[PDB]
Design an enzyme around this catalytic site. Structure first.
Site, PDB file in Angstrom:
ATOM      1  N   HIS A  42     -46.595  32.276 -41.394  1.00 33.49           N
ATOM      2  CA  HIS A  42     -47.643  33.080 -40.755  1.00 33.49           C
ATOM      3  C   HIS A  42     -48.350  32.324 -39.644  1.00 33.49           C
ATOM      4  O   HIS A  42     -48.941  32.939 -38.765  1.00 33.49           O
ATOM      5  CB  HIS A  42     -48.653  33.651 -41.765  1.00 33.49           C
ATOM      6  CG  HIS A  42     -49.689  32.671 -42.213  1.00 33.49           C
ATOM      7  ND1 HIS A  42     -49.567  31.938 -43.370  1.00 33.49           N
ATOM      8  CD2 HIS A  42     -50.868  32.309 -41.660  1.00 33.49           C
ATOM      9  CE1 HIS A  42     -50.623  31.155 -43.505  1.00 33.49           C
ATOM     10  NE2 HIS A  42     -51.431  31.368 -42.483  1.00 33.49           N
ATOM     11  N   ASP A  88     -43.655  32.622 -47.239  1.00 30.86           N
ATOM     12  CA  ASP A  88     -44.519  32.071 -46.218  1.00 30.86           C
ATOM     13  C   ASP A  88     -44.185  30.597 -45.979  1.00 30.86           C
ATOM     14  O   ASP A  88     -44.929  29.677 -46.367  1.00 30.86           O
ATOM     15  CB  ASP A  88     -46.009  32.286 -46.553  1.00 30.86           C
ATOM     16  CG  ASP A  88     -46.918  32.007 -45.339  1.00 30.86           C
ATOM     17  OD1 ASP A  88     -46.386  31.960 -44.212  1.00 30.86           O
ATOM     18  OD2 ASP A  88     -48.146  31.835 -45.502  1.00 30.86           O
ATOM     19  N   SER A 185     -54.224  26.374 -43.569  1.00 33.31           N
ATOM     20  CA  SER A 185     -52.974  27.125 -43.697  1.00 33.31           C
ATOM     21  C   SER A 185     -51.812  26.359 -43.078  1.00 33.31           C
ATOM     22  O   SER A 185     -51.925  25.836 -41.966  1.00 33.31           O
ATOM     23  CB  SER A 185     -53.106  28.463 -42.964  1.00 33.31           C
ATOM     24  OG  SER A 185     -54.454  28.885 -42.915  1.00 33.31           O
ATOM     25  N   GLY A 186     -50.703  26.296 -43.799  1.00 33.61           N
ATOM     26  CA  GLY A 186     -49.495  25.613 -43.299  1.00 33.61           C
ATOM     27  C   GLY A 186     -49.441  24.164 -43.734  1.00 33.61           C
ATOM     28  O   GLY A 186     -48.397  23.517 -43.631  1.00 33.61           O
TER      29      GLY A 186
HETATM   30  C1  LIG Z   1     -55.236  28.068 -50.348  1.00 35.66           C
HETATM   31  O1  LIG Z   1     -55.328  28.112 -48.931  1.00 35.66           O
HETATM   32  C2  LIG Z   1     -56.147  29.065 -48.395  1.00 35.66           C
HETATM   33  C3  LIG Z   1     -57.177  29.564 -49.178  1.00 35.66           C
HETATM   34  C4  LIG Z   1     -58.012  30.534 -48.659  1.00 35.66           C
HETATM   35  C5  LIG Z   1     -57.834  30.974 -47.363  1.00 35.66           C
HETATM   36  N1  LIG Z   1     -58.677  31.996 -46.934  1.00 35.66           N
HETATM   37  C6  LIG Z   1     -58.515  32.598 -45.759  1.00 35.66           C
HETATM   38  O2  LIG Z   1     -57.662  32.208 -44.997  1.00 35.66           O
HETATM   39  C7  LIG Z   1     -59.396  33.755 -45.384  1.00 35.66           C
HETATM   40  C8  LIG Z   1     -60.636  33.289 -44.625  1.00 35.66           C
HETATM   41  N2  LIG Z   1     -60.704  34.112 -43.421  1.00 35.66           N
HETATM   42  S1  LIG Z   1     -62.206  34.417 -42.829  1.00 35.66           S
HETATM   43  C9  LIG Z   1     -62.922  35.533 -44.063  1.00 35.66           C
HETATM   44  O3  LIG Z   1     -62.825  33.134 -42.865  1.00 35.66           O
HETATM   45  O4  LIG Z   1     -61.905  35.064 -41.597  1.00 35.66           O
HETATM   46  C10 LIG Z   1     -59.750  35.227 -43.498  1.00 35.66           C
HETATM   47  C11 LIG Z   1     -58.619  34.660 -44.381  1.00 35.66           C
HETATM   48  C12 LIG Z   1     -57.842  35.747 -45.094  1.00 35.66           C
HETATM   49  O5  LIG Z   1     -58.349  36.820 -45.370  1.00 35.66           O
HETATM   50  N3  LIG Z   1     -56.578  35.487 -45.441  1.00 35.66           N
HETATM   51  C13 LIG Z   1     -55.672  36.349 -46.103  1.00 35.66           C
HETATM   52  C14 LIG Z   1     -55.972  37.140 -47.201  1.00 35.66           C
HETATM   53  C15 LIG Z   1     -54.959  37.940 -47.752  1.00 35.66           C
HETATM   54  C16 LIG Z   1     -53.660  37.904 -47.246  1.00 35.66           C
HETATM   55  N4  LIG Z   1     -52.628  38.691 -47.775  1.00 35.66           N
HETATM   56  C17 LIG Z   1     -52.038  38.355 -48.960  1.00 35.66           C
HETATM   57  C18 LIG Z   1     -51.074  39.129 -49.490  1.00 35.66           C
HETATM   58  C19 LIG Z   1     -50.637  40.274 -48.805  1.00 35.66           C
HETATM   59  C20 LIG Z   1     -51.187  40.583 -47.602  1.00 35.66           C
HETATM   60  C21 LIG Z   1     -52.214  39.769 -47.085  1.00 35.66           C
HETATM   61  O6  LIG Z   1     -52.759  40.060 -46.027  1.00 35.66           O
HETATM   62  C22 LIG Z   1     -53.376  37.102 -46.163  1.00 35.66           C
HETATM   63  C23 LIG Z   1     -54.386  36.337 -45.608  1.00 35.66           C
HETATM   64  F1  LIG Z   1     -54.130  35.532 -44.554  1.00 35.66           F
HETATM   65  C24 LIG Z   1     -56.780  30.495 -46.567  1.00 35.66           C
HETATM   66  C25 LIG Z   1     -55.948  29.513 -47.093  1.00 35.66           C
HETATM   67  F2  LIG Z   1     -54.919  28.994 -46.363  1.00 35.66           F
END
Ligand SMILES: COc1ccc(NC(=O)[C@H]2CN(S(C)(=O)=O)C[C@@H]2C(=O)Nc2ccc(-n3ccccc3=O)cc2F)cc1F
Ligand SMILES: [Ca+2]
Ligand code: NA
Lengths: 234, 44
Positions: A42, A88, A185-186
């Site tokens: 992603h 991913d 991420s990544g």
């Molecule tokens: C563990 O690492 C991490 C932990 C938390 C985060 N948290 C985040 O990145 C959230 C923080 N921001 S924000 C509010 O600050 O703007 C938005 C990100 C988000 O909403 N991500 C998100 C949510 C859901 C799916 N998803 C899953 C399945 C199907 C479809 C589908 O879209 C995909 C996504 F990108 C990231 C990590 F990389």
């Protein structure tokens, strides 16, 4: 990283940072060899053009050991889709080999059967990166690390708005304000076994960051060990 | 392998090691071949 601590010198040497045209870090990566970086599929969508920086610990200061690499080939998993965030995973072949040094060294890839039975059954893993220090806040200028407990798959499914697949695992905390966040991420999730750190996950996604009743979701690298081997042989 | 990982330093009795490592004399420990072996934090 929400919570956690800055990495000490040489503690997170497999950390790579993907940097966009604006010279800004937007995603992490894991050094796998002199020519290969492991990242999330992603992440490839977020910047039309990017480079890899290794050896960096503070993005505001140029310190010894930092080096930038052009990516020669992007190998993205063909089954990745934003609909599910499944599969991913991506591998980047770099134009020019990384020179291993202080703060720059690969994480080990484990054997599938052994990792599943021995590594993934450990209590905790370590995640690291330059991402947001709070859900809606700024990216960190310093490289941070965080110890994250493995979370039972079933507990995680119950907590999640989205499908948790066999290609994912969960880690982190129910209510404690510690988690990876956007920008991480990544990046690497590694698990120590004795004195060797093995790459077990790719920082993938979560609902918010450090949210009560939500966990961090990682790509389960064991499911892709043959795919990584195949990708690294061109 | 079930208990103690077969007393192996890395992979499990038949011990083995990741790339950049060789199985020691004792057949259990893993010996790094270069100065920057995979999975080791770096020291100055
Ligand atoms: C563990 O690492 C991490 C932990 C938390 C985060 N948290 C985040 O990145 C959230 C923080 N921001 S924000 C509010 O600050 O703007 C938005 C990100 C988000 O909403 N991500 C998100 C949510 C859901 C799916 N998803 C899953 C399945 C199907 C479809 C589908 O879209 C995909 C996504 F990108 C990231 C990590 F990389
Ligand atoms: Ca720097
Ligand atoms: Na949480």
């Amino acid at each position: 990283i929400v919570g956690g601590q800055e990495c000490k010198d040489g503690e997170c040497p497999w950390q790579a940072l993907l940097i966009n045209e604006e010279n800004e870090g937007f995603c992490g990566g894991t050094i796998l060899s002199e020519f290969y970086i492991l990242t999330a599929a992603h992440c490839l969508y977020q910047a039309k053009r990017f480079k890899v920086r290794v050896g960096d610990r503070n993005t505001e200061q140029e310190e010894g050991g930092e080096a930038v690499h052009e990516v020669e080939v992007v190998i993205k998993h063909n089954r990745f889709t934003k609909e599910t965030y499944d599969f991913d995973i991506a591998v980047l072949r770099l134009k020019t080999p990384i020179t291993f040094r202080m703060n720059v060294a690969p994480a080990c890839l484990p054997e599938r059967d052994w990792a599943e039975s021995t590594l993934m059954t450990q209590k905790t893993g370590i995640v690291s990166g330059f991402g947001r220090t709070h859900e809606k806040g700024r990216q960190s200028t310093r490289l941070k690390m965080l110890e994250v407990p493995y979370v039972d798959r079933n507990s995680c499914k119950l907590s999640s708005s989205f499908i948790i697949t066999q290609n994912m695992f969960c880690a982190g905390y129910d209510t404690k304000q510690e988690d990876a966040c956007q920008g991480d991420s990544g990046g690497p999730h590694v698990t120590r076994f004795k004195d060797t750190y093995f790459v077990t996950g790719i920082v993938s996604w979560g609902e918010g960051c450090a949210r009560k009743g939500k966990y961090g979701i990682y790509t389960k690298v064991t499911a892709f060990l043959k795919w990584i081997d195949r990708s690294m042989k061109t | 392998c079930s208990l103690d990982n077969g007393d192996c330093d890395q992979f499990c009795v038949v011990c083995s090691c990741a790339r950049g490592y060789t199985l020691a004399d004792n057949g259990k420990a893993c010996i790094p071949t270069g100065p920057y072996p995979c999975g080791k934090q770096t020291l100055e």
